[PDB]
Amino acid sequence: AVVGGLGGYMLGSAMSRPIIHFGSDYEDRYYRENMHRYPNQVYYRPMDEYSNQNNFVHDCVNITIKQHTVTTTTKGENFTETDVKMMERMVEQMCITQYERESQAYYQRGSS
Numbered sequence: 001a002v003v004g005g006l007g008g009y010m011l012g013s014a015m016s017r018p019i020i021h022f023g024s025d026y027e028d029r030y031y032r033e034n035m036h037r038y039p040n041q042v043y044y045r046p047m048d049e050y051s052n053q054n055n056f057v058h059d060c061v062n063i064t065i066k067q068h069t070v071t072t073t074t075k076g077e078n079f080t081e082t083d084v085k086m087m088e089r090m091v092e093q094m095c096i097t098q099y100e101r102e103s104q105a106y107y108q109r110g111s112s
Contacts, residue, residue: 003083008103009063018090031086038087042094043067057095064091075094 002011019039020031031038044060065088072079 001098004043006043008046009043011043012041012060012094012098015094018094018097020086020089020093026059027086027089031090034083034086035090037065037089039068042091053099057092057099060095061088061092064090 002014004011018035018038021028040058042064044056045063047056047059047093065084068087069084
């Protein structure tokens with residue numbers, strides 16, 4: 001359970017291990033630590049329209065970022081543009097990784 005409320009948004013079931021890998025050790029390393037304070041789940045809007053894949057993917061990102069800033073602002077915000085981009089990268093990856101996970105989950109067990 002994750003208490004949030006919000007104005008009618010749907011919560012993701014979190015990820016087993018949200019990891020970032022650019023190939024540049026800076027990003028990889030920086031995210032490994034900051035994940036402790038970053039979320040493990042994202043927030044998406046229960047839209048009615050059909051839209052396109054990118055719409056829903058990016059929607060989860062925009063909401064999570066936009067709500068997360070208001071969160072820290074209430075706490076006397078203190079973050080860099082890099083922090084926001086890191087938390088943005090991960091939440092963007094949530095949708096993309098789940099896209100991957102939806103595909104792999106199609107196969108029963110692992111051995112046919």
